Design a protein around this nucleic acid. Structure first.
Lengths: 199, 199, 199, 199
DNA sequence: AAGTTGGGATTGT
DNA sequence: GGTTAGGGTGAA
DNA sequence: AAGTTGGGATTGT
DNA sequence: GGTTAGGGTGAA
DNA sequence: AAGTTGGGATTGT
DNA sequence: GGTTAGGGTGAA
DNA sequence: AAGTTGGGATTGT
DNA sequence: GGTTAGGGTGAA
């Protein structure tokens, strides 16, 4: 529900920051590699956040980049992996270092991670690979999370994304968009013709 | 609890917008037909919202118009239908297009919707019809949600609404208000004489 | 957790108001007798609130006066009575009218209330009486909620209140404070000597 | 999630304060010894908070000092002890008085506490001792909560803290940091070499 | 060294 | 809360 | 009119 | 979700 | 005085 | 919600 | 083509 | 979590 926080860094107790937005100071759990980039205390920060709601607790996970947030969101989906593991994962190695490891099948590095033996280690590199690359090694090539989250147009990605939010199966979503063939239209325009055609 | 959000559109990833209110950026899930009307990023937006609270998650559903929110709230009440379906429903066709379909029994269109076969399709048009019309085809004739939500006075509608919030049965609420016969009094005044008479 | 809301009245749909605080518009459920006192839309309002948190939902109940909030909080404690009943209760009759009815055992009036037959009706007047009066008929004589919530000093009341928040039994709390005999000290000072003596 | 509140003290009803931050007034439950230090009403206050989320309720616990918050957080961990007991505990005696009692095994004082007989009394002094002292009697010697929460460097403490947040066992965390031997580096730098070495 | 018996633990239900 | 992994210890 | 058999419903668990 | 009241309807 | 039988209650599940 | 403490009352 | 056997899935509990 | 729909695939 909370997607981003923008306020003054009041305090730093890794892995958590205390950012004041208005008069309310929120606690944000951030991966060490991200934390290293937080501006000095007293400075204003902007951090994308993944909000977690439990029956007994509700925490905030933050990242400096949307891509970073996305990778983390995909990581948590992975079986056996939750907020804590992903956090540890992104403290030992950076979003890049991870991409790299999964596309270079550097299991070793992943295993030595606290709480992550061969089993999940492999799971990661497996469930994660496919998604990557479109990235072509760089985690910041354009529309990186569309890539992760959904190489064809940026707007087509976005549209396939949305169609899948609406219930269409991914095959369906893709085929549905391309049938339209218009990489140079607004992602909303595609989402719109596509729909109009589906029904 | 949250009934409206007013802030700067920070980002757009259909179907969700990221609106910053103060320093907090809220994620809002909006039907594609609504989304199409959102001002450019950077602009200020005002979106009525339906807040959903689960044990494991709490999301925000937004609409450009109160009527739009109301229709959605009625849709979710419908059996087999929840936030996601209604969202899809209002992405394939607009509040109007829906009204139209239910009052013209255009099942076809509804069936082709992702996740909505004949069964719920019919349920919709059935449970929804009665409520409509007072609307007389237009979704924006005056006090449209009173119509949906509760053709006699605007204040009588509102009052019957409230009386039903308090526990009176709808028959009761209606008869109770009209007994007062004063379409030209404040909805609060009716709610007030009515009560005074009931007790 | 939320104890008060202060913002601009954006809209009125009895029994709920939509007050904007900053950029966030909160929905507040208020008893009709209270609602009648809300300033015009567009004006700024201040409303004490009772926050309700469920597994499937979290609403806000508001009152113009702390006393009004207190009475409602005591009402909800009453067995068989919850937010909705109390709301109805305070829509049919005012905090005064209620006090009056309980201290004049006007069951009749209470029974005719929607959802409140003889059974709870009596329960009310029973569980509520004792608490009242110190009030001496007026709901706004000084420190009315201390009265309800905890005729001796205002500070002694407050202190007995706190001691009971800490685990002391009410008998204990009272006797403990008076032993101190100092109606003219700060409620905090009493809470402080009292404690110091208990341990 | 909420780690601090900064606003205007709107009202005082010990043990709870009503602080307005922006337009929202939050209720904060504070131990009497802390409460005694709150500035006059109308003044601005800053209070560290421990946010509690239940299925049926979500309250805010506040303290004037981070150390005070930390002690309370450790207290709640203690078996048989929860927010209420700790609150009572810190109403009868101050963070100091407590430290003192645990390091001087003043069971007596603890027993007389409402709800705290010999059983938990001992538990406290037992589970709490070890943690203390590094404190050397004073609760405000530098990095007191690192002490409580994690006498070697401030940055090493912090780093061991973080490593333990990530899943490393405390033995592991400690040994891991010292192996680095660099009390004069940033806690982040340690967390960083340490990790780099672990993997 | 390689498999096993267990306590601990977020994860998933 | 039960269950699956984690990764520790003991066995062969 | 007085008690009873039931569907509906917030309340309480 | 089960359970207690509410207050409707039918019985006597 | 010392142990026991119970109602009450946050705590822990 | 069940369970463990709390601390009250009654027993010996 | 029409009914059936199943995996998937929000919905409802 | 169990359950009802959804809508896929296979059968006749």
């Amino acid at each position: 529900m909370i997607g981003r926080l923008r306020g003054i860094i009041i305090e730093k107790q890794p892995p958590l920051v205390l950012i004041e937005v208005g008069g309310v100071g929120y606690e944000v759990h951030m991966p060490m590699t991200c934390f290293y980039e937080l501006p000095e205390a007293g400075q204003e920060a902007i951090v994308f956040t993944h909000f977690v709601v439990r029956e007994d607790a509700q925490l905030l996970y933050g990242f400096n980049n949307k891509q970073e947030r996305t990778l983390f969101k995909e990581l948590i989906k992975t079986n056996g992996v939750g907020p804590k593991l992903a956090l540890a994962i992104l403290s030992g190695m950076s979003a890049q270092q991870f991409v790299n490891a999964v596309e270079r099948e550097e299991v070793g590095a992943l295993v030595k991670l606290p709480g992550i033996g061969k089993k999940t280690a492999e799971r990661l590199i497996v469930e994660m690979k496919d998604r990557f690359k479109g990235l072509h090694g760089d985690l910041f090539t354009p529309a990186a999370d569309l890539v992760l989250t959904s190489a064809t147009d940026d707007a087509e990605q976005e549209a396939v994304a949305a169609l899948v939010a609406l219930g269409y199966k991914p095959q369906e979503a893709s085929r549905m968009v391309s049938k339209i063939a218009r990489p140079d239209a607004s992602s909303e325009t595609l989402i719109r013709e596509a729909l109009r055609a589906a029904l």
